[PDB]
């Protein structure tokens, strides 16, 4: 339910989740133990018409926590988190030989 | 892989797919041979330069197609696609017994 | 698990369903959205009293779901369902060449 | 083609066997070498219209023989058996510690 | 031992079937309840000298029933029929959304 | 994949091949490396225009090659090859203990 | 969560039951029907400092019951059961040819 | 196959094994290359007497060797051990965010 | 090694051995505890030609043992075995209802 | 299935079958297509009467058949085949680089 | 194509690469970011006669490229690489609780 | 296991086996049965001391057997063996149809 990418560019460490028609209320980014980037959640139901005919679902996502541990401990008030186009994005700044023998 | 739902309102059959992290300019919705409905697009890769460094990598990249056959009398010239929150939307308008014994 | 049989007369479509042990008040009939024919019920389980003894037991208990989608044009107010001898029966009544190259 | 239970109450040995739509006269019950219940049969074919279409058959039944080592020897004027609603059925009249170390 | 290809181009609908060492008098194109092609057949006993030696057998082809039904009834009259080179050709002769948000 | 059967005849050893579909310009047969039959050729795809369109397909396409080892002492100079019917025929001349106890 | 065993010395039958760190308030010996030893238990929680962190967790025992058929109904009042070591203990007192041809 | 936990309190790394039927003078418990927290020791297989007779064996027996490497900095002087009912305890002194872009 | 037939006929249970090639005195046909038939023995090496040179090993028989429970206790002294053809024998002496309900 | 070894002597390629429980009215002995060595024959099964009762069968039965290429110089005249103990015999007569670098 | 050894004796880490038939110039040992040894390499074709016949060919090396993380910075210029024999060697210099219960 | 291919020039066969860390004393190359190749040796394993570490073991060690059948007719006595660079050279010196239809 929440594929994630982690990518460490020198100035930061950007994290990258895929969390389609999720709600920010509905997404959590926490830090624990100083290093350990936290990320859960859980889409709400669609308060979609009650009665509707349901053909085909494979939308079918539910509750999920994720942690990372940061290679350093992150300065929690530096940390940025964005949600767009149904991609969450957590932003962490950062502070030849001879052969013969 | 775009995840797809179908359901069926007494109004229209709608669509709905995951494409998180795709605009609107990479996506596509149309009607072929007069009742195939076709969502395609791409979910671009961010290649990016070798500075970075990448840690964990589960999100997908690329082309997406998918295909669902709508009734021969449905409204085709009154599809409408909508696209918010990483989640794609198309509305497609539409045109007991007693046991013996 | 209710095993169904469909077979097709010049008349009608005719449907088959074992149900051992159901008696036809634990059997319904009906037809949903118009044109799906819809066998349900259940084969209660006869839990009886702790002085019995189980040397064995295959026989399934336990609610039974099935659907047949019947054609646009049928005589839907003249579907007919019988149950005998552990058999429901539905009747649902109906609206060469040469080689050389 | 025969799913069978076997129950022993205090009063006798009830055997139950899903049978649906099979008749008598192609059930049997018999009782071998004094303690051997045994059931056999075959469902006939139904002798219903030659020449439907059959689009779907689940309902496939063939011949069976199974057999029961009863605790007793049974007395045999006493076994009943009677077959309703596609179930067949056998009834057979039988005659804290301390922890320390 | 009748790998079969359909193609619709908008003339017609043309299936071909590899049928390699077969007889015209061994293979039969039909049409059945108006819109379903039926080919079937069974190549012969090589009627070769009967004593040779079998080193190698891999040429191995039986009896066989294929059906295809047809999108409108066809004109049997007008279904063409050709057996040439192992392959039998049956010829039947036929009569963008703009995304808002 | 073309199959070849390999039999023997006190005159011979003959092989076949089937090949539907393929003229006798896509095939050829030679003699390798002294004693080994090479059968050899390609099964052309008839690619078409896209105002086609494909509901089946079965059949395979492309090139297939064949070998077999033939005797040290055979007729290399007298190997016939004949084509009919999707079949190829190729034709290379060639050159009790009674128990004790 | 019990791996037992089961000894028969010419003096008594002897079962050991691995049931490490289990209290004999948590674990149960009856005798059933004269001659069914009933082993049963259920190791409580550690009821260890709430708020640990459980870095690794093999240990983890369940509800169980085990039932052996003794070959002669056991003299209840002499059959002992002692707990030591996390190994349970249950005692229970019992009472060449030619070849040619 | 000995199964360990391993749970870390503010003051202590601690360890569980489960051992039933261990005496202390079966089991070794050490500290290697600085390190490296070994557990080791052996299960006595009782082998007894040919008068006796097995009718269930599920308890393992032999050599046991448990290894886990400590922080580089824990007080290796003050480990502590100890084994009772079966389980043997080791200890080991030690030395929200806003989502919107 | 030993593929063995049990037979009961009114007179007798007879027990077959497929043996081949072994000898007596590789063959041990014994009863244990009065109603316990034993058949064990090894397949000698052949004394052949030391030296020679093995194209093909199939025949690979070695040691082996066989119980079988007799229904009651043998007269030993009436129990005949013999060794023919590479099969050992042993001989061991002995002393409907109605549907309807 | 009869199990064959394929030695070879200075004097001759010698096979071994185990035949257990064959006469040797049974067993058939050839040489075919002038240097195959064909060992054929049946396992009589004893099909015996109905008052029998069978507790347990391994020992097959029927027919076997078994075939050896020879050399096309071989004693085909002087090929000799013995059957003991369940074992046939066939006797088919017969007609250090130092390292561089 | 480069199954590899690694030792480390108390004065270095020594690494061992089976590269049979490779020539210097086709392997490469480097050392990054510090404390990472890259060993990589492709063997050559062997320029030997165009045109021979290959019967079997199982020595299939190709392209490979591997990693270790040195447990120490290495001193680069006191890194030795020699090549012998197929082998690839790469040298690194570097710098009891009683239980109570 | 060691890898071996088999060339064949129009001079001669050749052989070429990958074994790299082995001396040409622990190679023997030779020809048994007056017409089988058979190349043998040992990879011997460098055991050392205890004060040793292994972090990785890949590579194998011990016997190693290869045998090829060679030519009726080849120079049996003109066979050399090269071994350098860890590869190991044996050198066994060598004594279009028109399709109708």
């Given at each position: 339910n929440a594929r994630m990418d982690?990518?460490?560019t020198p100035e930061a460490h950007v994290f990258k989740a895929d969390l389609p028609g999720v709600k920010?209320?509905?997404?959590?980014v926490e830090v624990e133990d100083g290093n350990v980037?936290?990320?859960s959640g859980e889409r709400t139901k669609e308060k979609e018409d009650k009665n509707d005919k349901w053909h085909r679902v494979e939308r079918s996502s539910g509750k999920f926590v994720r942690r990372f541990?940061?290679?350093?401990?992150?300065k929690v008030e530096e940390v940025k988190a964005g949600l767009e186009n149904?991609?969450?994005t957590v932003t962490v700044p950062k502070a030849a030989i001879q052969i013969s023998g």
């Open positions: 982690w990518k460490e920010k209320e509905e997404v959590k980037l936290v990320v541990r940061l290679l350093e401990d992150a149904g991609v969450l």
